[PDB]
């Protein structure tokens, strides 16, 4: 079946709940692609909030702000898989695993568009949910 | 609360099924924003397929390929709402309504990424469905 937007979301939600510490290299490489693709489903103006949420979840200090943010920025602007393939080659397994698990567990809760889009009418379109 | 990726999907799915022909201007303007935002959830390499699927659903001939593709390309590359606002100003209500309804009814069925991503391992991650 087609890899639709919804299929991506369902894939991210499944893997956010897995312990991927010993997953085979082929699957970990594919999860890096999933994180790259999903980062590009955020508008560029949300990347700073992605980074700050990532830092807070992982208990990182402001020391790690610039590095984490550059990773999200360079995934967002990547072309031809260039930066993605460099991260695979240049990061150790543990860092990649921790970054992937953090991202997948925050990516589905954070707003994916910024305020200029959200506050100018789009919220009047959002349909009713449970409980609610 | 947050306008997450899933919330965007649920909003598109809801409005794809509505008859929007007499919706108030404020909602039609917001649906145009939704279409622009959602176009940017496709990779640039999928825009040609979005255009061709649009043409087939609407019964348009190959004449309208270039204009439909330019619309998708210029929404995809838009900054600061510039092209989006020009579409609102320069298109008649009927054309906008038809384009919005066509897009929302094809966007949730088409692949959002191209082959270089899909065929090199991502498919092995997709979880089981009903």
Resolution of this structure in Å: 1.8
DSSP label at residue B120:
T
Q: Do B7 and A126 touch (CB under 8 A)?
A: yes
Q: Do B41 and A41 touch (CB under 8 A)?
A: yes
Which string of DSSP letters, residue by residue, matches chain A?
----HHHHHHHHHHHHTS--TT--HHHHHHHHHHHHHHHTTS-GGGHHHHHHHHHHHHT--GGGHHHHHHHHHHHHT--TTHHHHHHHHHS-HHHHHHHHHHHHHHHTTS-SS-HHHHTTTGGGGPPP-TT-
Q: Do B110 and A2 touch (CB under 8 A)?
A: yes
The technique is X-ray
Retrieve residue A122's tokens. Answer: 């789009």
- Sequence-ordered list of residues with C-beta below 8 angstroms from that of A70, at least 6 positions apart, any chain: none
Q: Do B37 and A117 touch (CB under 8 A)?
A: yes
**From the list B11, B31, B108, which residue is nearest A4 (CB)?**
B108
Q: How far apart are CA A129 and CA B10, in angstroms?
A: 9
CATH topology of domain B1-130: 1.20.120
CATH topology of domain A1-132: 1.20.120
Q: How far apart are CA B31 and CA B28, in angstroms?
A: 5
End-to-end CA distance of chain A: 33
Outline where chain B has alpha helix (H): 5-16, 25-39, 47-58, 65-76, 82-90, 93-107, 115-118
A6 contacts on B by Cβ (under 8 Å): 9, 108
Retrieve residue B118's tokens. Answer: 């899909």
Q: Do B113 and A43 touch (CB under 8 A)?
A: no
CA angle B38, A126, B74 (to 5 degrees): 20
Nearest-CA distance from A34 to chain B in Å?
7
Maximal CA-CA distance, chain A: 47
Tell whether omega for the bond before B76 is within 30 degrees of 0, i.e. cis.
no
Q: How far apart are CA A121 and CA B29, in angstroms?
A: 8
Q: How far apart are CA A109 and CA B3, in angstroms?
A: 9
Q: How far apart are CA A82 and CA A132, in angstroms?
A: 44
Whether residue A46 contacts residue A110, with contact meaning beta carbons closer than 8 Å, is answered with yes
Residue of A nearest to B14 (CA): A127
């Amino acid at each position: 079946g087609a890899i639709t937007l919804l299929t991506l979301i369902k894939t991210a939600e499944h893997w956010a709940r897995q312990d991927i510490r010993t997953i085979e290299d082929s699957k970990l490489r594919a999860l890096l692609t999933l994180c790259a693709v999903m980062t590009r489903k955020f508008s560029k103006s949300q990347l700073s909030l992605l980074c700050e949420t990532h830092l807070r979840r992982e208990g990182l200090g402001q020391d790690q702000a610039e590095p984490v943010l550059e990773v999200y920025q360079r995934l967002h602007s990547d072309k031809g898989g260039s930066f993605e393939a460099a991260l695979w080659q240049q990061w150790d397994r543990q860092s990649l695993i921790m970054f992937i698990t953090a991202f997948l567990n925050i990516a589905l809760q954070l707003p994916c568009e910024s305020s200029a889009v959200v506050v100018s009418g789009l919220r009047t379109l959002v349909p009713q949910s449970d409980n609610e």
